[PDB]
Amino acid sequence: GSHPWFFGKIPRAKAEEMLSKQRHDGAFLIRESESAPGDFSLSVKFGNDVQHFKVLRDGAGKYFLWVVKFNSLNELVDYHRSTSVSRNQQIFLRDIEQVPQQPT
């Protein structure tokens, strides 16, 4: 239990910063709308820029942010981790910042 991609209450820009030093175009993190009282969202590096998806709720507890929805945040990650995200290339959610635990 933890969050290898979720953040909590940060600014999309902060997620646009940790995603800018990333290396795999797919790196992602989820943000709880720092401007809202609690609006889920997610930043991800596609090519080098940081585009984010708005996260919504089905009103029952589901979470979505693009096309298909799910029943868990990390669930939407793994899904988009094997499924592309944009119709322009094949990008997927990946791990951002934190480096590969133990990287010098």
């Binding site: 585009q51 984010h52 998806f53 708005k54 942010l65």
Partner: peptide, 13 residues
């Protein structure tokens, strides 16, 4: 000054 989020509904608001 918000960048929005790719899926984010259009700015129609």
């Amino acid at each position: 000054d918000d960048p929005s989020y790719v899926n984010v509904q259009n700015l129609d608001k």
